[PDB]
PDB file of C-alpha atoms and ligand atoms in Angstrom:
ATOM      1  CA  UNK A   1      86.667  30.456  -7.839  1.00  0.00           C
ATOM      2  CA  UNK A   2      87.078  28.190  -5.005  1.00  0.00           C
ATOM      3  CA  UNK A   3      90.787  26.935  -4.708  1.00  0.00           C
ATOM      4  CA  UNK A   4      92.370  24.163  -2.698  1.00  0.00           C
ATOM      5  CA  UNK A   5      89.422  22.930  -1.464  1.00  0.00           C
ATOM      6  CA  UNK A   6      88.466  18.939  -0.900  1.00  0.00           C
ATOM      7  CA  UNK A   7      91.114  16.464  -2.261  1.00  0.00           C
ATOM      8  CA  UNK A   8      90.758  15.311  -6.100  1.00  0.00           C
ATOM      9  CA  UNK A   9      89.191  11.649  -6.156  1.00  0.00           C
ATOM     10  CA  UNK A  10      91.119   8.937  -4.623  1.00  0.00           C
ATOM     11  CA  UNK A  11      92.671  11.077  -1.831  1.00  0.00           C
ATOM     12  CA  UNK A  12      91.372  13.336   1.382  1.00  0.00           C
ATOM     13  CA  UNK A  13      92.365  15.859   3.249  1.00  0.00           C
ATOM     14  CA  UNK A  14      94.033  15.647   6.231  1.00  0.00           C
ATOM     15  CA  UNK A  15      91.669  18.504   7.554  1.00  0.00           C
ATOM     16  CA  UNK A  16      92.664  21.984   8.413  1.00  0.00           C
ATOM     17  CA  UNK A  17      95.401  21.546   6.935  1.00  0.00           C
ATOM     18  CA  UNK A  18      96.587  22.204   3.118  1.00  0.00           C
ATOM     19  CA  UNK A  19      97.807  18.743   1.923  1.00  0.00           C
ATOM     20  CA  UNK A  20      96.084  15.798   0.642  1.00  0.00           C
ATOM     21  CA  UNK A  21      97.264  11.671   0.697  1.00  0.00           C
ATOM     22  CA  UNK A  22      95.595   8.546  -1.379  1.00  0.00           C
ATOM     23  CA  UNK A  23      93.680   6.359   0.774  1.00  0.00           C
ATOM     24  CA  UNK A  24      96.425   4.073   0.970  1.00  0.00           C
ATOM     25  CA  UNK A  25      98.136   6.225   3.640  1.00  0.00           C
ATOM     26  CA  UNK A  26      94.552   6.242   4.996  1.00  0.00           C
ATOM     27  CA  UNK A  27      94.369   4.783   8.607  1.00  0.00           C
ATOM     28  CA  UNK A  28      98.025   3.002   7.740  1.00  0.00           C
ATOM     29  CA  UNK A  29      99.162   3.069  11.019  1.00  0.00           C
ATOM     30  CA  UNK A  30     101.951   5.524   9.190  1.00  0.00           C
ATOM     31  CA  UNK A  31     102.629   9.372  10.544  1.00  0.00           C
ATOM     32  CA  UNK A  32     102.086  11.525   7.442  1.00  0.00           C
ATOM     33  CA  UNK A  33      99.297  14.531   8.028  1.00  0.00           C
ATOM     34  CA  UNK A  34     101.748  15.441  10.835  1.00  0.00           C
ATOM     35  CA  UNK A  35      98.837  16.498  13.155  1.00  0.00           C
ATOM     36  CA  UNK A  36      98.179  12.576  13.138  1.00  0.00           C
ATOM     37  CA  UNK A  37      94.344  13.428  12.332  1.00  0.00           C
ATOM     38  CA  UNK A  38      94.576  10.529   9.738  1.00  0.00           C
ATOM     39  CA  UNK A  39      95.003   8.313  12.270  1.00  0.00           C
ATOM     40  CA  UNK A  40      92.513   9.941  14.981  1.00  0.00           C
ATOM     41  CA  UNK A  41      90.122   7.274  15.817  1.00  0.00           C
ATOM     42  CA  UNK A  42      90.614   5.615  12.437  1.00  0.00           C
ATOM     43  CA  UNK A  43      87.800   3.197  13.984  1.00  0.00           C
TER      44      UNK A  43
HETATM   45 CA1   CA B 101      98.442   7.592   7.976  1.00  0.00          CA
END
């Protein structure tokens, strides 16, 4: 019953926020999740 919940394999959500982005946008150094929490402290 769940819906829109985790990413499918291979890509991760941004957070709180409905959208999800392969790991090659991961930590780019690229805008994309729009609330930049892909790039928070990427480490
Ligand atoms: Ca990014």
């Amino acid at each position: 019953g769940s819906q829109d919940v985790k990413c499918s394999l291979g890509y991760f959500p941004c957070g709180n926020i409905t959208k999800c982005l392969p790991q090659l946008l991961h930590c780019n150094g690229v805008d994309d999740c729009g609330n930049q929490a892909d790039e928070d402290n990427c480490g």
